[PDB]
């Protein structure tokens, strides 16, 4: 799909 490390794992 698209990388978890840029999405589900990304933080603010």
């Amino acid at each position: 799909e698209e990388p978890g490390s840029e999405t589900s794992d990304a933080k603010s």
Partner: antibody
Framework: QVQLQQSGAEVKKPGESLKISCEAS????????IGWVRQMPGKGLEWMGI????????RYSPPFQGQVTITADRSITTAYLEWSSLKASDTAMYYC??????????????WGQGTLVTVSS | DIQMTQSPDSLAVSLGERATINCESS????????????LAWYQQKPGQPPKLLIS???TPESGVPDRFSGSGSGTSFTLTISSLQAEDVAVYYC?????????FGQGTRLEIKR
């Protein structure tokens, strides 16, 4: 600069509990994922899991899901790895390592120097 | 869960010769949107923690000697040592950081062939 200072070598009996620590400095502790890698004697690196101290969110790889618990303490910039009941096959080197870029997933950089855990009767 | 398979397990290369270490992922590590490969290479010398050599597949850390290069894309990646030197004997690991867990390859042991 960035330092990841791990607690000392442990020698434990099977069935005992154990929490090892990694003290971080030189960066904003809550803006980086930080985690643990196991290396059993003579074998490869195994990614165990990571924690984001900004919101305590965690990730584990399946073989360590439900085996260990990773926590962090924002107030002392320290991450932890905990077993309830050690077994002999938990004998290994355990590396703490910070993800190499803030606020997102990624590779590990830098690494701690390691904590050797020996579990034996 | 992405599996990372390195080949060979063990590699013997004569000093001054090319050393080639392969890494294959079970899923692609190419993010089509930014065209980036979510692949790192690590070097671990005996008695020492692993050290990052390459991120984003094709990109060495600062101070990594020019004889190291990383290549490939998608599911097929290669670490190349153009001319093997004594200081290069180590175990090399690839690692994907595309989807958690960020799994390592099983390691490739590089030795001097004599």
């Amino acid at each position: 600069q960035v330092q990841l200072q791990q607690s000392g070598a442990e020698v434990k009996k099977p069935g005992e509990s154990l929490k090892i620590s990694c003290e971080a400095s030189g960066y904003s502790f809550t803006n980086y994922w930080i985690g643990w890698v196991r290396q059993m004697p003579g074998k490869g690196l195994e990614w165990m899991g990571i924690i984001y101290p900004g919101d305590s969110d965690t990730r584990y790889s399946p073989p360590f899901q439900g085996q260990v618990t990773i926590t962090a303490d924002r107030s002392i910039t320290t991450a932890y790895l905990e077993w309830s009941s050690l077994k002999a096959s938990d004998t290994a080197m355990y590396y703490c390592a910070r993800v190499g870029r803030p606020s997102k997933g990624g590779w590990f950089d830098p690494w701690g120097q390691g904590t050797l855990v020996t579990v034996s009767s | 869960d992405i599996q990372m398979t390195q080949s060979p397990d063990s590699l013997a290369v004569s000093l001054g010769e090319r050393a080639t270490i392969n890494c294959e992922s079970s899923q692609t590590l190419l993010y089509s949107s930014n065209e980036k490969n979510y692949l790192a290479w690590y070097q671990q010398k005996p008695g020492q923690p692993p050290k990052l050599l390459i991120s984003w597949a094709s990109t060495p850390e600062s101070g990594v000697p020019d004889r190291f290069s990383g290549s490939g894309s998608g599911t097929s990646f290669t670490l190349t040592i153009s001319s093997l030197q004594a200081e290069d004997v180590a175990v090399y690991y690839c690692q994907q950081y595309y989807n958690s867990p960020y799994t390592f390859g099983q390691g490739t042991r590089l030795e001097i062939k004599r």
